[PDB]
Amino acid sequence: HMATRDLVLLGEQFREEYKLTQELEMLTDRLQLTLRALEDEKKKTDTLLYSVLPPSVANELRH
Amino acid sequence: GSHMATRDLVLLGEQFREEYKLTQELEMLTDRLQLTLRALEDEKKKTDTLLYSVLPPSVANELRH
């Protein structure tokens, strides 16, 4: 017993779930970009931390 | 000797706070992810109910086991 109402409404349910997965994709895309921004910031911080050291000590830490 | 001048110290302080700003954005985004997942769970149970509801009760009961 699937009337026209139930069929239309099932169609609308699928569409609502797609809007939500589209939001999940946008969020995860942004999360990956913000992680990359953190990686880039960290590279700068790390450089600054090495820069204040005596070179033989810096050398020793780099491995 | 080491050479951490006042400039280097101040800048390192600025590096740390720039990084906290980024981790705060990461926490916000992850919060929104979990909120969006919860809305999807809520929507999925409505869809699920609709799909059971159109079946003969016996069939739905049988699938529910």
Residue numbers in the entry:
A (entry chain B): 346 to 408
B (entry chain A): 344 to 408
Please share text taken word for word from the publication where this structure appeared:
The soluble guanylyl cyclase (sGC) is a heterodimeric enzyme that, upon activation by nitric oxide, stimulates the production of the second messenger cGMP. Each sGC subunit harbor four domains three of which are used for heterodimerization: H-NOXA/H-NOBA domain, coiled-coil domain (CC), and catalytic guanylyl cyclase domain. The CC domain has previously been postulated to be part of a larger CC family termed the signaling helix (S-helix) family. Dimerization within sGC is mediated by at least three inter-domain interactions involving the GC, H-NOXA/H-NOBA, and CC subdomains.
